[PDB]
Design an enzyme around this catalytic site. Structure first.
Site, short mmCIF file in Angstrom:
data_model
loop_
_atom_site.label_atom_id
_atom_site.label_comp_id
_atom_site.label_asym_id
_atom_site.label_seq_id
_atom_site.Cartn_x
_atom_site.Cartn_y
_atom_site.Cartn_z
CG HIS A 90 -13.18 6.19 -58.61
ND1 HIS A 90 -11.95 5.46 -59.22
CD2 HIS A 90 -14.45 5.58 -59.04
CE1 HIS A 90 -12.52 5.13 -59.94
NE2 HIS A 90 -13.89 5.29 -60.04
N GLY A 139 -9.98 1.23 -67.19
CA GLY A 139 -9.34 3.16 -67.68
C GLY A 139 -10.61 4.06 -68.51
CB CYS A 163 -13.46 5.15 -64.03
SG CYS A 163 -14.41 4.24 -63.56
C1 LIG Z 1 -13.08 2.96 -63.81
O1 LIG Z 1 -11.93 3.46 -64.68
C2 LIG Z 1 -13.51 1.33 -63.29
C3 LIG Z 1 -13.88 0.76 -64.52
C4 LIG Z 1 -14.47 -0.24 -64.54
C5 LIG Z 1 -13.08 -1.32 -64.82
C6 LIG Z 1 -13.72 -2.62 -66.06
N1 LIG Z 1 -14.74 -2.11 -66.46
C7 LIG Z 1 -15.74 -0.67 -65.47
O2 LIG Z 1 -16.52 -0.38 -65.87
N2 LIG Z 1 -14.00 1.10 -62.35
C8 LIG Z 1 -13.21 0.41 -61.25
O3 LIG Z 1 -12.61 -0.38 -61.26
C9 LIG Z 1 -14.09 0.67 -59.93
C10 LIG Z 1 -13.79 1.56 -58.69
C11 LIG Z 1 -14.25 1.26 -57.66
C12 LIG Z 1 -13.47 2.66 -56.49
C13 LIG Z 1 -15.71 1.69 -57.79
N3 LIG Z 1 -14.45 -0.53 -59.51
C14 LIG Z 1 -15.29 -1.93 -60.18
O4 LIG Z 1 -15.30 -1.66 -60.87
O5 LIG Z 1 -15.01 -3.39 -59.52
C15 LIG Z 1 -15.90 -3.71 -60.47
C16 LIG Z 1 -14.99 -4.89 -61.29
C17 LIG Z 1 -15.80 -5.51 -62.46
C18 LIG Z 1 -14.11 -6.50 -62.93
C19 LIG Z 1 -13.15 -5.90 -63.43
C20 LIG Z 1 -12.70 -4.59 -62.68
F1 LIG Z 1 -11.76 -4.40 -63.01
C21 LIG Z 1 -13.61 -3.63 -62.13
#
Ligand SMILES: *[C@H](O)[C@H](C[C@@H]1CCNC1=O)NC(=O)[C@H](CC(C)C)NC(=O)OCc1cccc(F)c1
Ligand SMILES: *[C@H](O)[C@@H](C[C@@H]1CCNC1=O)NC(=O)[C@H](CC(C)C)NC(=O)OCc1cccc(F)c1
EC number: 3.4.19.12
Lengths: 306, 306
Positions: free
Chosen positions: A41, A143, A145
Site C-alpha cells: 500500500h 509511519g 508500516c
Molecule cells: C502504516 O504506516 C500504518 C500503520 C498504522 C497506522 C497507525 N498505527 C498502525 O499500526 N498503516 C495504516 O495506516 C493502514 C493502511 C491501510 C492501507 C491498510 N490503515 C490503518 O491502519 O487504518 C486503521 C487506523 C486506525 C487508527 C489510527 C490510524 F492512523 C489508522
C-alpha cells in the site's frame, strides 16, 4: 534467576531497514540482497481509493516513483514487482549487511521479536505472540508500516511478519514476508475487526511452570484432571483446547518441577474458576499466555545468538 | 496505538560485547575505543570469595593473564587499571564499531534497556527500571556478569549499568560504568539483602496518562487533591513521595490530555483504595511503575484519542 519477556538482539535486522517513500506516503522497507520488501500500500493510491487496484496502480508507476533511502543514502531502484501484499523493489546494490536469513510463516501461539521503525530508523524492539485470532498486541504509530518481526536461530534470521495496519481495538495485523496476511484481513481502509480472542492454553501452562521454578507455589494442589475434563473448563473460559501434543512439548518442564502437566491443569481450573485470590504469579495479577514452552526453556538456560 | 515495554535497538551495543577470562572465570566485557570494561571480580580465585583484596589480586596479574575475545579474534591486553569495582583493560586495537557513547549515573525510577549476554554473545534485550532500593528485577544466569544497561538518545549510547550479582530475593545489582555500585552493595559473597522496595509513584502516573492517551478513561474521577494529601495517602500504600519536580515533569503529558497532574493523583488515590475490580489498564491488572514520563512520550503519539 528471574523471568522476563525478552526480545532477540536486533542488530542483525537494524542493518536491513530502509525508508520507502512514494508520493505523500512514507514507510519502512527491508533491504535484503538487492531487493527491498515493503507493504504494497505504499503505492500512490487514487486520491480517493475507496477501493484501490494495486495491480493497475503499479503499472502506471516508473522505477523513480519510489524513493529508497538507506541511512542517509539514496538506493537506485531498477525494477519493481508485487507478490501478494508485499512490494518487491529491485535495487542496483546488494546490501553488504545482509544476514543469513529465511522467510517463515509462524503459527498462532508462537512468538517473535518486533523491531519498530519510523522513516527507516529502528526505534524500539519488543516481543509479540501471534494470537489465536491472528492479531498481535503491539505498539505502532503512523509511519511504522514495514517494521518486521523475526526470530534468530544461532545466526539465521527467520523473518516472519511485516507490519501493515491497526484494527479498531488497538491491536495490529500484518503479513508474512511473502505478502500473505495472518488472519482474515485485507489492506484497505475499510471496516475491519478482530475476532474474539482466546487464551493460548499451552503458554499459560508453560508460564505457570516458569513460576514454580522461580519459587511461586501457592496455586499448586495435589489434585489432577484428565485431558478431556480440563478442555470443557477451557472452552467455558475462552481458552484454546489442550492437545496431546501440547502436553508432550510440556514434558521437559513437568520433569523439572515434579508436577504432571494434567496435575498443573488442576491448578488452572482453580485459577479460572476461583481466581488468584489476591495473589500474584511472576509479578502479574493476570494469567500470561505469551511465553511459549521454549521461551521458558530459552530463559532457564542461556542460549546466545552469535 | 498500543503500549509495550520497549527496549532500544541493541545493535550499537552488540558490536561492543566481548568475552573476558581470567583463569577459570568467564564473563562479558564492554569494548569501547581501546579499552574493555568488565566487573573486577573476574580476577577472583575460588579459594576465596567472601573477602578478596582486589588490589592485591590485581597486582599479582600480568597483562597476558587476561584473555579477551571479540567473536573469533583474541585481543591483546597492553595495560590494566582498576576504578572502584570495574576493571579497565587497555587493548592494542580500538573497537572499529564504537558508537557515540556516554557513561551516566541514573537515579532511582529511571529506566534502561538491558542486553543480556553470555560468553560475550548477546542473548536478549529487555527494559528495566532502577528500583528505589537500588535493585533491578532482571533475568540473569551464571555467566551474565558484564552485561550492560543503556539508553539511546539520537544515536548516542548512554551506558548506565553493568551487571555484577544476584541478591537472595532474586533481584539484581550492579554498578555504573565508573564502577560505583547502585545501592549499599559490595561484590563479595557475604550476607546481603535488598531494602524494602517502594512503588515509583511518578511512573505510575505517567502510565495512567499513557492509558488516557490510548483512549482509556474508566479510572478517572471528578475529584482533585492537594500534593500533601496525596502523599499522605500514597505513603500508606508504600508509594514513593511525589515531589514538585515530578509534577513539573508530568507537565507535557498533562497538557496533551487536559488532565491536571493533581487530578490524575486523585484517580490514583481511588485506584489504590478500590483496586481494578476485574478491570485492566493497558493490559495489566496491576499499577505499573517501570515507565517513566519520557518512556511514555517516546512511545505514545502526541495526538490523544479523545
Ligand atoms: C502504516 O504506516 C500504518 C500503520 C498504522 C497506522 C497507525 N498505527 C498502525 O499500526 N498503516 C495504516 O495506516 C493502514 C493502511 C491501510 C492501507 C491498510 N490503515 C490503518 O491502519 O487504518 C486503521 C487506523 C486506525 C487508527 C489510527 C490510524 F492512523 C489508522
Ligand atoms: C555472574 O555472572 C553473576 C551470576 C549471578 C548469579 C546467578 N544469576 C546472576 O545474575 N553474578 C555473580 O555470580 C555474583 C558475583 C559476586 C562475586 C559479586 N555472585 C552472586 O550473585 O552470588 C549469589 C548467587 C545467587 C543465586 C544464584 C548464584 F549462583 C549465586
Amino acid at each position: 534467576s528471574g523471568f522476563r519477556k525478552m526480545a532477540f538482539p536486533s542488530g542483525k535486522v537494524e542493518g536491513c531497514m530502509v525508508q520507502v517513500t512514494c508520493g505523500t506516503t512514507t514507510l519502512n522497507g527491508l533491504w535484503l540482497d538487492d531487493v527491498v520488501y515493503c507493504p504494497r500500500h505504499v503505492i500512490c493510491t487514487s486520491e480517493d481509493m475507496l477501493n484501490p487496484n494495486y495491480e493497475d496502480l503499479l503499472i502506471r508507476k516508473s522505477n523513480h516513483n519510489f524513493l529508497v533511502q538507506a541511512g542517509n543514502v539514496q538506493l537506485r531502484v531498477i525494477g519493481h514487482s508485487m507478490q501478494n501484499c508485499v512490494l518487491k523493489l529491485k535495487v542496483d546494490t546488494a546490501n553488504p549487511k545482509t544476514p543469513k536469513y529465511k522467510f517463515v510463516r509462524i503459527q498462532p501461539g508462537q512468538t517473535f521479536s518486533v523491531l519498530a521503525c519510523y522513516n527507516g530508523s529502528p526505534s524500539g524492539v519488543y516481543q509479540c505472540a501471534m494470537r489465536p485470532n491472528f492479531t498481535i498486541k503491539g505498539s505502532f504509530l503512523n509511519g511504522s508500516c514495514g517494521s518486521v518481526g523475526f526470530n534468530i536461530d544461532y545466526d539465521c534470521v527467520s523473518f516472519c511478519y511485516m507490519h501493515h495496519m491497526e484494527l479498531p481495538t488497538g491491536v495490529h495485523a500484518g503479513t508474512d514476508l511473502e505478502g500473505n496476511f495472518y488472519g482474515p484481513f485485507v489492506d484497505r481502509q475499510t471496516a475491519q475487526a478482530a475476532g474474539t480472542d482466546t487464551t493460548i492454553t499451552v503458554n499459560v501452562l508453560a508460564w505457570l511452570y516458569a513460576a514454580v521454578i522461580n519459587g511461586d507455589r501457592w496455586f499448586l494442589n495435589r489434585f489432577t484432571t484428565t485431558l478431556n475434563d480440563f478442555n470443557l473448563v477451557a472452552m467455558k473460559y475462552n481458552y484454546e483446547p489442550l492437545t496431546q501434543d501440547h502436553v508432550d512439548i510440556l514434558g521437559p518442564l513437568s520433569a523439572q518441577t515434579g508436577i504432571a502437566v494434567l496435575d498443573m491443569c488442576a491448578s488452572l481450573k482453580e485459577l479460572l474458576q476461583n481466581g488468584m485470590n489476591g495473589r500474584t504469579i511472576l509479578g502479574s495479577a493476570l494469567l500470561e499466555d505469551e511465553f511459549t514452552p521454549f521461551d521458558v526453556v530459552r530463559q532457564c538456560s542461556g542460549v546466545t545468538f552469535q
